[PDB]
Design a protein around this ligand. Sequence first.
Ligand SMILES: *SC1=NC(C)(C)N(O)C1(C)C
Ligand SMILES: [Cl-]
Ligand SMILES: [Cl-]
Ligand SMILES: [Cl-]
Ligand SMILES: [Cl-]
Ligand SMILES: [K+]
Length: 164
Amino acid sequence: MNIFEMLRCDEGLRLKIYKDTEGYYTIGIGHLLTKSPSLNAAKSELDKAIGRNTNGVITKDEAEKLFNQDVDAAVRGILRNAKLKPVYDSLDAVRRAALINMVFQMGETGVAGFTNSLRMLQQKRWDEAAVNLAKSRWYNQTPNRAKRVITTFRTGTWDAYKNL
Ligand SMILES: *SC1=NC(C)(C)N(O)C1(C)C
Ligand SMILES: [Cl-]
Ligand SMILES: [Cl-]
Ligand SMILES: [Cl-]
Ligand SMILES: [Cl-]
Ligand SMILES: [K+]
C-alpha cells in the first residue's frame, strides 16, 4: 500500500464523466472537474485538463496522468499551508498518506479548518483524534471512506486497506 493505491481504492476509476458523491462532475480517479451543474462546463474543464477535444471520455493513461498531478497538488497544498505543514511534518509516512487522502477529497482549505483534529494528531493522541475526526460532515456523508482514513490515523497501519 501507498498513497496512490490508497486513493485508487477510495476513488475508483471511471473513464467517462460521472458525478461524484457530492453530485459534481468528475472523471478518472476522482478528478473533480467543476462544481458547476453544466455538463458543457465540465467537458470544457476536461478538454483543458487533457489538452485535446475529448468526447467526455479519456483513456486509462490519461486518467492516471491527472491522478498523479492531483496527488502532487494535494502534497503541495499541504506543504504550503501554515496549518497543515506542521502536522504533516510531524507524522509517519502512513499517517501522512491519510492526510493527503483528506486533502485530495476535500481540499487544502477544508482540511486546514479541522483545527482541533489537527492538534490531536500533532499531539499523537490517536484515539482522541479518531473520535474527533468522526464528528464531521465528512464522516457523515462518506462514513465508510472516512472510517478507513480514520483507522489509518488511529493505527498508523494499512489495516483498513490491505484486505479490500
Ligand atoms: S482497494 C482496490 N484497489 C484496486 C483497484 C486494485 N482494487 O481492485 C480494489 C481491491 C478495489
Ligand atoms: Cl462530446
Ligand atoms: Cl514526535
Ligand atoms: Cl472530540
Ligand atoms: Cl457532528
Ligand atoms: K470517485
